[model samples]
Target: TFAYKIDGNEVIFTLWAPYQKSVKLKVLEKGLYEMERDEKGYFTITLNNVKVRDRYKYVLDDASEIPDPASRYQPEGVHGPSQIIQESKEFNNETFLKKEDLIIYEIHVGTFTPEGTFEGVIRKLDYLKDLGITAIEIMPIAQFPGKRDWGYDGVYLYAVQNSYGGPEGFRKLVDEAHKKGLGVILDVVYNHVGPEGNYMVKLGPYFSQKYKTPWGLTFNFDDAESDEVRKFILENVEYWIKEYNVDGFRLDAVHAIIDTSPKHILEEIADVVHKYNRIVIAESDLNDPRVVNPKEKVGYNIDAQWVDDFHHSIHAYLTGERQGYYTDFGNLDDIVKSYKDVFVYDGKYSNFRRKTHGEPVGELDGCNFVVYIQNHDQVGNRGKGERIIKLVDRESYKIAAALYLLSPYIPMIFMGEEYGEENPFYFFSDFSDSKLIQGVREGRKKENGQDTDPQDESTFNASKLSWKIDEEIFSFYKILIKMRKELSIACDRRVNVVNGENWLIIKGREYFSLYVFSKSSIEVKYSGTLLLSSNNSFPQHIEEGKYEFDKGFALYK
Candidate 1:
């Protein structure tokens, strides 16, 4: 709520600094003016001469200068002054997509193409539509310290990243997406801000010292004088929906957020977003159903949540690596339970955590969960940032894609996952501070034990998509996605799973899906009309009421 509001030629500046003794508005090349403070610790000043593209900063106690916390644009880097920019006020013409109909394609704009900008993504809308994508889930575009990042380290919550062609280019991307019948879901980080170029601490008590997250200090949601801090984040949700015309949000890392108030921040955000008729999907490690359950059932009432168990169970089963969290998985039962129960670790004792983890999701709608095979975290967090295709064979890759895309839950495809992209999505950044840069290098070394420099331009450049299409791999995904749209059996919630020693079959209302794990051919009952098959050799020998498959998958109608 503390931002510059433009009305005709006049601009009203507002800032929430309850503890500061004095606050002054300093317009670049226009001198400073004392702001009037109210009882609620809000400072206000109106200037009729201020116009767009004017750089400004706030002076605290007439001494320390910092950029506006709610700045709309950061044309310069995060350390530089904030600029006043005009946003497109036109009516939203975005395509409407229901929660169940969302075929989300997650993309990091910085590495999606060679250009690494909104205009770059705008050039690929037709390609996504041809692949049967309904929405594109963009990673965080909030302003950070330097040019290249995965974008989770965004510092300014309201300002767009200048390197990615700031507000104007983003507006055009959304407008163009709508024209092509595609929705835009922006990923937002609220649990913790970035480490470098963080100026909110100089303005007010925006963080809580009571609780600590893995990233750092958590946002002050339920601490003392926390109302203003909570308002600061809530207003940011409204800002994106109104200004950029984003269709919905993919809230990043909701499990790390800590709050003891009667109403949690996630619920508050869902309430405001629902009024605008947009969806709110959360990325959470917590496997509790309360995140997507209705408020009447004492839940957060968010529209949907990403399920990491689906990926873990599949990845562990194929690769056979029983390290870290993969120790809890690696059985055929895990895959069968994931399809029928939606959570493999639901109330089960996990050896990885040395305790029982997750609650059972009983009768919740399947659309409330989003499933993915390969994502940024699973690939980029490794030493070499290997994609799923690198870990398994070509047959396994085809089976993995069909398994998740044809599941009862909603599906999300990572940027290069559609056409079996082999490029590694290494973790990279462009921090300027020597100490912070060195600290990141040490931490990455300790974790990954690799010499991949995060601050190097080569690391960032290497992550860009090659855009070279593999005809076979691309055709496999296109067929599966086409079937997902045309067939009702793909989304059917009531599924019966039958697991063999090296195979599994999912029987739906009028169709069934078969996945074979063993290299040798295996025979199974119920051979109906062949709808689609990943491997062509098995379908040639379809006997009466029986079929054999070898290290591949098939669908029957």
Candidate 2:
């Protein structure tokens, strides 16, 4: 049992552990304080004058110290210290931002800057804002087990990762970004808690064996003690938006969150989020439009989803890697289908899955979906952790970037994609548990094929962002972002296909801008001024009526 009460700015804590006869409130700062035992076998403490910054731990009667059950901030790992945090009101959703003019930059805190801390990221706010990114989608910053990690192993939802400057540092980062007109979209994992440094199970039945997830036992969403568990997760979601001033949350891997209740957790989350007028984005592989559909008919009502089909189609066509998921894509027809309908595999036979997959994303606007040429999963999952820049030539990278940023869909740029940083984003963590390390190693091997040592050391080291930009590629990305912002058609929500084979010609009405993507060197005639070109070698001005393709791809307005 657990109990807490607020008294004179001090929180009195109590826990019922019948098996234990004695317990102490172990303040990380001060020494352990003896607790008063009650008739109900409950251990109680009234720490007078405790403030928000006070860090504390609890020592059980068994003489083992554990982190607080309701820790608002963990400056150290779960085995270390916990700090009280300022109570923040629920997030105000009435100030909800629109997605139409948004350009998102996806970043991982550990890899986003040379310093690899929250403050380090703060220094780059001006750079991002100048690059035309309206939002920054930060990968999970929650507390995990180690000094370094990819953040999928987060175990403490309420606390910011200690390695990345903890709670206050994160607050500064978010506040700074908001000051620069940039919204913060935090990536949150609710599918399953990490295996290491997790103590939730010891305190309560947080995981259920009834349902198995790709990570482990699923969260006990419908079990006897599940109400509290669900509350815990929901409270964490509210914490980010309410406490940190975050604009929205990006739910990680919703496919594994198996729930069959009348009001699914997703729907509940949507209701809670909308009540505050904040956005909820889901990373779903389901390809079901219903995921983003509003809650009129018991739907999840998410604002947007990552359209993997767009990524797959682009990757397969450009890279020609017909392995695994790529086997189902990579043809002019498929690319055109996605370009036209936004879901290439909707109700179609998937060779990789050997079954029909995806429902029609019928008449859905492109802005509701996010399109990317490369993301963390796509680049990091490669055998050598190579970026798209490493896979193809500069011209090809430019073409892909042009296509992505100019599309009617909401565009996302992976960190360092602007300057084409050559560093690899390999999976890495600092778990010390031998069993857990071995499990992670084996899991990576099973998922992608090789167990060759650990990629963590090299991957983490290589993932650091190089602030210096190579004149040529840097100029290319800079011009592309500017063009994307300045051209009305480039960022328009409605798209119409205007022309042909091996090349896709799209027209966005706003700016009357025209975009063209071609696999081979060909020229097309368009009645507009030449806006940009992937291959700089192409003539800046093409005849107004018609033109011959002298370069791989070209964009004109």
RMSD of each: 1.6, 3.5
RMSD of 2: 3.5
Tally clashing residue pairs in candidate 1.
0
The 10-residue segment with the lowest total lDDT in model 2: 510-519
Candidate 1 residue lDDT tens string, 417-457: 88879998888888888998998898877887546898988
Pairs of residues clashing in candidate 1 = none
Each prediction's Cα lDDT score?
A: 0.84, 0.73
lDDT by residue (tens digit), candidate 2, 120-182: 889889988777787888888767778767788788777778888877788888878878878
The number of clashing residue pairs in each candidate reads: 0, 7
Model 1: what TM-score? 0.97
